[PDB]
């Protein structure tokens, strides 16, 4: 449960939601807000892991 | 090839639509498409015996 | 200058692009759009009470 | 007398353990319902 609730969390994006960020942002812009995403996904799997 | 999670008739249903990602085929025949809880396993033949 | 301000979060928006409707379908895998909101997925006739 | 073959103790002691997956299938309870968490709902990526 912690690890799906994990999945609404912005970690500094716009937005939860991939499908938002790459709506609105060119790749330029849209990457960064993916990664800020991607980082806090991996720390949360890493955690689960572990 | 072992489909974890998923029905044979969906699995059926997508072979036929060409709707899967992976885009080689096991291929099927009738006794080769087995439903188990662990997934639709295609390409062996359950037998009675154990 | 103009500062042209607004929330992209709220479900019931009203300014649309000029973006060109289909028609809906449902009960198959399709890649929608409404209002912005975009995904992949199978629509089926809801038993919500919105 | 009874499928699965098990003692009374062992009924009591499978009924009185509440299950949380009871892993199978489960592709019957995606639609309509209240989409009840499992914990995924298989759309997350845990199974
Ligand atoms: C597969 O789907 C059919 C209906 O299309 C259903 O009767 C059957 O029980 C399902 N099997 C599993 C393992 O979900
Ligand atoms: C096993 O035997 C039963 C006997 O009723 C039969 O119905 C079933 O189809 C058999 N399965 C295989 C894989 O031979």
Same mark, same amino acid.
């Given at each position: 449960?912690?690890?799906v609730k994990?999945?609404?969390?912005?970690?500094?994006?716009?937005?939860?939601?991939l499908?938002?960020?790459?709506?609105?942002?060119?790749?330029?812009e849209?990457?960064?807000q993916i990664?800020?995403?991607?980082?806090?996904r991996?720390?949360?799997?890493?955690?689960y892991?572990? | 090839?072992?489909?974890?999670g998923?029905?044979?008739?969906?699995?059926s249903?997508?072979?036929?639509?060409?709707?899967?990602?992976?885009?080689?085929?096991v291929?099927?025949?009738?006794?080769?498409?087995?439903?188990?809880?662990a997934?639709?396993?295609?390409?062996?033949?359950?037998?009675?015996?154990? | 200058?103009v500062?042209?301000?607004?929330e992209?979060?709220?479900?019931?928006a009203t300014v649309?692009?000029?973006?060109?409707?289909?028609?809906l379908?449902?009960?198959?895998?399709?890649?929608?759009?409404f209002?912005?909101?975009?995904?992949?997925?199978?629509?089926?006739?809801?038993?919500?009470?919105? | 007398?009874?499928?699965?073959?098990?003692?009374?103790?062992? *009924?009591? /002691?499978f009924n009185?353990?509440?299950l949380?997956?009871?892993? &199978?299938?489960?592709?019957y309870? *995606?639609c /309509?319902?209240?989409?009840?968490?499992?914990?995924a709902?298989? &759309?997350?990526?845990?199974?």
């Amino acid at each position: 449960n912690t690890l799906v609730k994990q999945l609404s969390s912005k970690f500094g994006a716009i937005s939860s939601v991939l499908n938002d960020i790459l709506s609105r942002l060119d790749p330029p812009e849209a990457e960064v807000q993916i990664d800020r995403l991607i980082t806090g996904r991996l720390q949360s799997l890493q955690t689960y892991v572990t | 090839v072992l489909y974890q999670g998923v029905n044979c008739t969906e699995v059926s249903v997508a072979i036929h639509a060409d709707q899967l990602t992976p885009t080689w085929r096991v291929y099927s025949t009738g006794s080769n498409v087995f439903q188990t809880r662990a997934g639709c396993l295609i390409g062996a033949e359950y037998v009675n015996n154990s | 200058v103009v500062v042209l301000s607004f929330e992209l979060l709220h479900a019931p928006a009203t300014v649309c692009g000029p973006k060109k409707s289909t028609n809906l379908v449902k009960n198959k895998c399709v890649n929608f759009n409404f209002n912005g909101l975009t995904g992949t997925g199978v629509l089926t006739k809801s038993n919500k009470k919105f | 007398s009874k499928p699965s073959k098990r003692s009374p103790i062992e *009924d009591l /002691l499978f009924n009185k353990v509440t299950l949380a997956d009871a892993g &199978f299938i489960k592709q019957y309870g *995606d639609c /309509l319902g209240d989409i009840a968490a499992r914990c995924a709902q298989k &759309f997350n990526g845990l199974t």
